[PDB]
Design a protein around this ligand. Structure first.
Ligand SMILES: CCCCCCCCCCCCCCCCCC(=O)OC[C@H](COP(=O)([O-])OCC(O)COP(=O)([O-])OC[C@@H](COC(=O)CCCCCCCCCCCCCCCCC)OC(=O)CCCCCCCCCCCCCCCCC)OC(=O)CCCCCCCCCCCCCCCCC
Ligand SMILES: CCCCCCCCCCCCCCCCCC(=O)OC[C@H](COP(=O)(O)OCCN)OC(=O)CCCCCCCCCCCCCCCCC
Ligand code: SF4
Ligand code: SF4
Ligand code: SF4
Ligand code: SF4
Ligand code: FES
Ligand SMILES: [K+]
Ligand SMILES: [Zn+2]
Lengths: 94, 207, 114, 114, 95, 176, 154, 263, 125
């Protein structure tokens, strides 16, 4: 940021860009190193009523695998065929 | 849609169940069990003789097209007569789907090498041989891959100790690195963590 | 009691594989001492080979023998191709091990291990 | 429709005559499936999906439209899959996986947790 | 209070000190024995006992969420003081 | 969506062709690359002047461990052994007994700093904020044995660094 | 890119080096840029999305020659798309808690642990025994920067 | 012949008349939660942690004490049963002290473990907690009576097993206090067993206090030689040191008790 | 084609274990006793195999517990006693099997607390 106008011109011409607008050294545009305290929110289960754990217990709704076949009509695939990707309209050719 | 519970996807569960019985119908010679888990993962459990026929069918069949071998690993379960479970995780780019194929073997029984089906299997099978000792027949170049040269034993077996049996140091007298029986300045501390109260009734085993 | 073989269908077939391995190990020792510049003699190395074969002479399962030959062949390939270093080759001789007396009294003095 | 210059996949050459090539391969698959027993699920399922693909090829003379109907990527990918299916059908004859299960597993081979 | 044994070695707040004839004190020769000289047992005894009015008082160690889990101390026994099991502060029911 | 990184057919008009012949023969694109490093030569370097200048850290930084006290001077550690149980590296070793006044206190508190992974789990598990990872990262030693901390070392670290440790905990405890 | 992309020395060292066909990459178990360099249109963030990847817009770079140069260009263009995603995450960051509000899995807040009996018990148990996981096995994968990174977890 | 038929979650089981709902569940491998119930003590039925729904009955029954009737279907995992457990656990923890880090029971506490498995994951109690004064009953058992959950196991063990009638409850309501009332030492030869049967850290071993945690001990199953009864024991050790002695169940010798000297 | 092998499974020569820790070890096959401090029985379901305890000594530098036993922390879980015994035979370990201890069924009667004429009448509740 302290570079002179001639040097700013020289490294701008050599690089072919405006290097000054996007300096790679950080100055005072960064956040202050002392911040105010936060006050973080609580989650959905922070209720005093209608909040029985047995209605929100994910581990207890896990079940053993379903036995489809055990050695103890149209053809199917594992899932529908994947759709063909479309080219980007943002920038199709780099 | 309860915020903390993983949502259940039933369209995939039906789709995977349908394809599971499709595989079993076509390959009754080898398929022993088919199951779908509550997070929608289809597993085919087969006789070890069917490793090549089952994997080849899944790779090549037009309604399968599992062209990519994601992973090939083994699990050691000492309580079983065939302690080693061999696990193939396959990916189908065409149908954007995954399938797991499982077989079994023991210490003295070989498994056919699947390298002819997936060239990816070459190093996976070397790793399984190195870490579990499961021999793969007709493997192009089977030998240790992860352990030290001359290392004895198969570390990922449950009965192999965590710190092994030997350790290395430099000995000045012989001017080389030597191997000696392992002694630890502090023994690894075994923790008994299991709670004596059942956690998951849905998985309770009948007495 | 009908199991899938690894290579040899019976002990007679397995023993032929053992002798083929032993010849390969016997022939390779002079090169190993030369290539690795080991201070041992060709006799010392060949005695060690015999000792490693002799400790497995009580096996009668053709499958267990086949695995031993498989591991022996891999063990030889590392030596010939110089994947092993001198430290790996000399680990067979336990040169830094202080001998552990095997009699009851000597064990009794040194500790509780039987 | 003008012929492509590239399939987009490295090593997968552009096919000059896709319709004829597909008809040849689908016909060969149907010929190979005639040697599998009529009750084998592989035959009934592979014949069904094969006849549906062949019917599309005979009804859509445009390579772009046909690709959209087959839903198998570029038409050269579809040709490759047809070749892979034909390779499988020949192998299945040797394997005969329509036979009954070769062996039940031990009692608790697939029980988890222990 | 940090003590020195007749061998001159400082005694730690856990009572550890190599006894005379223990070779292991050679490790301190030409160096030092790291000893913390702020004995927590001594410091906590210097705190005044706090007189309160209720039968039960609670202690979180001070500083709210920066202290210890909040506990409640019975003060019915008038021969002794109620001590916090976390931080060691003492409490007394005033009359 | 997808895009092509390298699928462009260059134009074949004599001006474009002549432009590329100039590029091949006059090295224009290699000269252009020289311009970039020339521009960097005249930029201020990013080097800081260590140890007179330090790199920026945050109050959450995980550095050297220390055992803390209450304002009275009593130790916070009550030998609960939660830190020893959670330690992924088994770097913590603890022994405890009733103190001379009946207090529940440790007689051993070792951290093997060559086992520790400086993961901070121990200070998460501690229910009384006894064990923390302070801000010090400049404690390299000349011997291995100097990195095997016992309770006396860790308590001295707490007294040494408490002024900074307290201020960092004050700045971040509301995120915990 | 001003140093490498158009540099004839760089292109000489990378163009037509280590060509891999699309079929070989699949059968050899490749993933990530080792597939997209050869033209295989595949990205687990697009086809098997996880977390909130279905809610961001980005393009998948695709190569045409399957060589070192194309994989170099794919990686550089992936960095540009990462910045594009990062801009969306910064703007669409929602409020709320950061771990599942279920104290049998995620530990409670320190203030709660020091006040509430249930919170202290769960904090104590989560940092000693840890949470039990229902029996099962999953293969779970992501589009890691180097390719498909997965765990088969039993 | 006399066995009647009942159902546990719809699975048939044959039990003798007089079997309790808790024992019927035991047969199919279900263990109902408990605090006051101990199979070697008289039934108490006061903790209410064993409440279980009987299909078609609007009221949950105390499984530890209710005898099963023919044809009952015990629903051990019903929404009604699960809510009963959460409510009771909530009451148990309302006045319980936040003592786990300083409590010797931590890591092998039935209150901790059944709170993890059957209770809720948070609190809605916003009041001040009860605080109880401690009591000396000798040099072997330390008492932190604020942790007591009034299960009365210790009272029943002392009266029935030890044959000593010194322990009991005084007062009533929330201020009901387990103890001896007067200053008295409970110095039986079987006294140390009340440490084991107390589900919480209210009664703990003075010699063992603060020295170890359950997860880090190694368990060696051995035999006692303090007398000729041959009591079966577990020797807890850690890092090469004997930490404590615990009973080992043997129905034909010491059941689940050991003498004080053995302990 | 399957062959007929007619010997007991022995894998000791292909496990890599040193000779010392096969012949000198004594494996204990048992169902763990219930920890008496808790009423839960979920840790008494599976069979375990453990090895004999060997010397631990104090590290001179720190006083930590040192060991020279590679099997000091080795514990294996089995569904049944036979599975554990089968594992011990093929590895060549001498072993001791302790029979499972199931609590004896009890007869519980709440009403017995208030007996008219028996000693089961309780003096307090
Ligand atoms: C043989 C050759 C060597 C001997 C020749 C000696 C020539 C005189 C050198 C004087 C340099 C003094 C630098 C200075 O003022 O420091 C101030 C500095 C305070 O300034 P500042 O606050 O840091 O701010 C600096 C600018 O903001 C940020 O700095 P800046 O980037 O803005 O530069 C400021 C100034 C600095 O330049 C000079 O003053 C010297 C110019 C001589 C050019 C010779 C080539 O440059 C200009 O003003 C523009 C004209 C410079 C000519 C540029 C030509 C580039 C080459 C063409 C491109 C193609 C290349 C292929 O104080 C110091 O740090 C003193 C340090 C002393 C260093 C040694 C100085 C002597 C150099 C060697 C002498 C021989 C021994
Ligand atoms: C009146 C009639 C007049 C008759 C005479 C008229 C003659 C005028 C026209 C003559 C042609 C002018 C150019 C002569 C220079 C040589 C040009 C040349 O050789 O360039 C080609 C060479 C290879 O490039 P490439 O594209 O990879 O190969 C062809 C692809 N098959 O490219 C290269 O050499 C690559 C070099 C790589 C290394 C470069 C590293 C240094 C670059 C910076 C140096 C800049 C120049 C410094 C000059 C200093 C002079 C003191
Ligand atoms: S930072 Fe992590 S590894 Fe280090 S002592 Fe703490 S818990 Fe253990
Ligand atoms: S440092 Fe904290 S977590 Fe570790 S034992 Fe002490 S009080 Fe417990
Ligand atoms: S008795 Fe259990 S729940 Fe209560 S403080 Fe002790 S360990 Fe915690
Ligand atoms: S002291 Fe223990 S055993 Fe006795 S009533 Fe209280 S919780 Fe129950
Ligand atoms: S166990 Fe039934 S009420 Fe206590
Ligand atoms: K207790
Ligand atoms: Zn306090």
């Amino acid at each position: 940021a302290s570079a002179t106008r001639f040097i700013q011109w020289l490294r701008n011409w050599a690089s072919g860009r405006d290097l000054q607008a996007k300096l790679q050294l950080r100055y005072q545009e960064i956040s202050k190193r002392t911040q105010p305290p936060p006050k973080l929110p609580v989650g959905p289960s922070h209720k005093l009523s209608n909040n029985y754990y047995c209605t929100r217990d994910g581990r207890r709704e896990a079940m053993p695998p379903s036995i489809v076949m055990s050695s103890q009509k149209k053809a199917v695939s594992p899932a529908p065929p994947i759709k063909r990707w479309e080219l980007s309209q943002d920038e199709p050719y780099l | 849609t309860r915020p903390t519970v993983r949502p259940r996807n039933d369209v995939a569960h039906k789709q995977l169940s349908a394809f599971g019985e499709y595989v079993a119908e076509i390959l009754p010679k080898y398929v022993q069990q088919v199951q779908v888990s509550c997070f929608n993962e289809l597993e085919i459990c087969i006789h070890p003789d069917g490793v090549i026929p089952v994997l080849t069918f899944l790779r090549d069949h037009s309604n399968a097209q599992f062209k990519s071998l994601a992973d090939l690993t083994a699990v050691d379960i000492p309580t079983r007569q065939n302690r080693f479970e061999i696990v193939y995780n396959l990916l189908s780019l065409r149908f954007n789907s995954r399938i797991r194929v499982k077989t079994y073997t023991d210490e003295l029984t070989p498994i056919e090498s699947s390298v002819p089906v997936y060239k990816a299997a070459n190093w996976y099978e070397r790793e399984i041989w190195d870490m579990f000792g499961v021999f793969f027949a007709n493997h192009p170049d089977l030998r240790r891959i992860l352990t030290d040269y001359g290392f004895e034993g198969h570390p990922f077996r449950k009965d192999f100790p965590l710190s092994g049996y030997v350790e290395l140091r430099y000995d000045d007298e012989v001017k080389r690195v030597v191997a000696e029986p392992v002694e630890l300045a502090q023994e690894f501390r075994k923790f008994d963590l299991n709670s004596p109260w059942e956690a998951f009734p849905a998985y309770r085993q009948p007495p | 009691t009908s199991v899938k073989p690894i290579f040899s269908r019976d002990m007679n077939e397995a023993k032929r594989r053992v002798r083929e391995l032993y010849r390969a190990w016997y022939r390779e020792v002079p090169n190993t001492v030369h290539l690795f510049q080991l201070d041992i003699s060709v006799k010392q190395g060949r005695d060690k080979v015999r000792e490693m074969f002799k400790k497995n002479a009580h096996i009668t399962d053709p499958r267990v023998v086949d695995l031993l030959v498989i591991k022996g062949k891999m063990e030889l390939e590392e030596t010939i191709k110089v994947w092993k270093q001198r430290t790996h080759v000399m680990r067979f001789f336990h040169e830094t091990e202080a001998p552990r007396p095997k009699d009851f009294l000597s064990k009794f003095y040194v500790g509780h291990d039987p | 429709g003008l012929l492509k210059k590239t399939t987009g996949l490295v090593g997968l050459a552009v096919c000059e005559t896709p319709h004829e090539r597909l008809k040849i391969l689908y016909t060969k698959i149907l010929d190979v499936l005639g040697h599998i027993p009529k009750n084998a699920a592989y035959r009934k399922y592979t014949e069904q999906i094969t006849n549906e693909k062949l019917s599309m090829v005979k009804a859509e003379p445009d390579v772009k439209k046909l690709e959209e109907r087959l839903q198998g990527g570029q038409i050269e990918e579809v040709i490759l899959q047809a070749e892979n299916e034909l390779s499988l059908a020949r192998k299945m004859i040797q394997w005969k996986p329509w036979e009954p299960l070769v062996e039940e597993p031990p009692a608790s081979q697939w029980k988890w947790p222990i | 209070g940090v003590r020195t044994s007749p061998t001159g070695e400082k005694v730690t707040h856990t009572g550890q000190v190599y006894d005379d004839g223990d070779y292991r004190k050679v490790r301190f020769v030409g160096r030092q024995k790291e000893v913390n000289e702020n004995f927590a047992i001594d410091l906590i005894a210097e705190q005044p006992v706090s007189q309160v009015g209720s039968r039960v008082i609670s202690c979180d160690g001070g500083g709210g969420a920066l202290g210890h889990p909040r506990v409640y101390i019975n003060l019915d026994k008038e021969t002794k003081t109620g001590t916090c099991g976390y931080c060691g502060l003492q409490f007394r029911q005033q009359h | 969506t997808y895009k092509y990184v390298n699928l462009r057919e260059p134009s074949m008009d004599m001006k474009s062709v002549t432009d590329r012949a100039a590029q091949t023969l006059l090295w224009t694109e290699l000269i252009r690359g020289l311009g970039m490093t020339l521009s960097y030569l005249f930029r201020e370097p990013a080097t800081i002047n260590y140890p007179f200048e330090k790199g920026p850290l945050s109050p959450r930084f995980r550095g050297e461990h220390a055992l803390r006290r209450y304002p009275s001077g009593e130790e916070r550690c009550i030998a609960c052994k939660l830190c020893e149980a959670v330690c992924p590296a088994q770097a913590i070793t603890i022994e405890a007994e009733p103190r001379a006044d009946g207090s529940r206190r440790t007689t051993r508190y070792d951290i093997d700093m060559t086992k520790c992974i400086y993961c901070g789990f121990c200070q998460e598990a501690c229910p009384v904020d006894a064990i923390v990872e302070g801000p010090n990262f400049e404690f390299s030693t000349e011997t291995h044995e100097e990195l095997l901390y016992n309770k006396e070392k860790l308590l001295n670290n707490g007294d040494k660094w408490e002024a900074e440790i307290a201020a960092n905990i004050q700045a971040d405890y509301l995120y915990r | 890119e001003e140093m490498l992309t158009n540099n004839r020395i760089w292109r000489n060292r990378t163009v037509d080096i280590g060509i891999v066909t699309a079929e070989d990459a699949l059968n050899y178990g490749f993933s990530g840029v080792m597939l997209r360099g050869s033209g295989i249109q595949w990205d687990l963030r697009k086809t098997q999305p996880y977390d909130v990847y279905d809610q961001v817009e980005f393009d998948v770079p695709i190569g045409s020659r399957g060589d070192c140069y194309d994989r170099y260009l794919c990686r550089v263009e992936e960095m540009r798309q990462s910045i594009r995603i990062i801009s969306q995450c910064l703007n669409k960051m929602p409020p709320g808690e950061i771990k599942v509000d279920d104290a049998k899995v995620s530990p409670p807040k320190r203030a709660e642990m020091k006040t509430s009996m249930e919170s202290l018990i769960h904090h104590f148990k989560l940092y000693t025994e840890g949470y039990q996981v229902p029996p099962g096995a999953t293969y779970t994968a992501i589009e890691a920067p180097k390719g498909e990174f997965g765990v088969y977890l039993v | 012949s006399n066995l009647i038929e009942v159902f546990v979650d719809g699975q048939s089981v044959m039990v003798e008349p007089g079997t309790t709902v808790l024992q019927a569940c035991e047969k199919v491998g279900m263990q109902i939660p408990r605090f006051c119930y101990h199979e070697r003590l008289s039934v108490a039925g006061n903790c209410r942690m064993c409440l279980v729904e009987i299909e078609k009955a609007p009221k949950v029954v105390a499984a530890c004490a209710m005898p099963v009737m023919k044809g009952w279907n015990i629903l051990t995992n019903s929404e009604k049963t699960k809510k009963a457990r959460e409510g009771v656990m909530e009451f148990l923890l309302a006045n319980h002290p936040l003592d786990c880090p300083i409590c010797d029971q931590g890591g092998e506490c039935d209150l901790q473990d059944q709170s993890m498995m059957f209770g809720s994951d948070r609190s809605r109690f916003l009041e001040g907690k009860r605080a109880v004064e401690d009591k000396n009953i000798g040099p072997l058992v330390k008492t932190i009576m604020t942790r007591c959950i009034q299960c009365t196991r210790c009272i029943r063990f002392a009266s029935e097993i030890a044959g000593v009638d010194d322990l009991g409850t005084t007062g009533r309501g929330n201020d009901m206090q387990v103890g001896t009332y007067i200053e008295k030492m409970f110095m039986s030869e079987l006294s140390g067993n009340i440490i084991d049967i107390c589900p919480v850290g209210a009664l703990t071993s003075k010699p063992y206090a603060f020295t170890a945690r359950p997860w880090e001990t190694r368990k060696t199953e051995s035999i006692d030689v303090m007398d000729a009864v041959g009591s079966n024991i577990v020797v807890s050790t850690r890092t090469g040191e004997v930490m404590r002695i615990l009973p080992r169940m043997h129905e034909d010798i010491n059941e689940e008790w050991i003498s004080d000297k053995t302990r | 084609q399957l062959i007929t092998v007619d010997e007991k499974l022995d894998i000791t020569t292909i496990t890599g274990v040193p000779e010392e820790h096969i012949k000198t070890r004594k494996a204990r096959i048992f169902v763990p006793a219930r920890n008496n401090m808790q009423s839960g029985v979920n840790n008494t379901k599976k069979w375990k195999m453990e090895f004999d305890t060997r010397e631990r000594w104090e590290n001179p530098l720190m006083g930590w517990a040192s060991t020279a036993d590679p099997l000091s922390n080795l514990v294996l879980t089995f569904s049944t006693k036979e599975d554990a015994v089968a594992f011990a035979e093929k590895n060549g370990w001498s072993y001791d099997v302790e029979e499972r201890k199931v609590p004896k069924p009890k007869s519980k009667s709440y009403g017995a607390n208030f007996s008219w004429n028996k000693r089961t009448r309780v003096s307090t509740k």
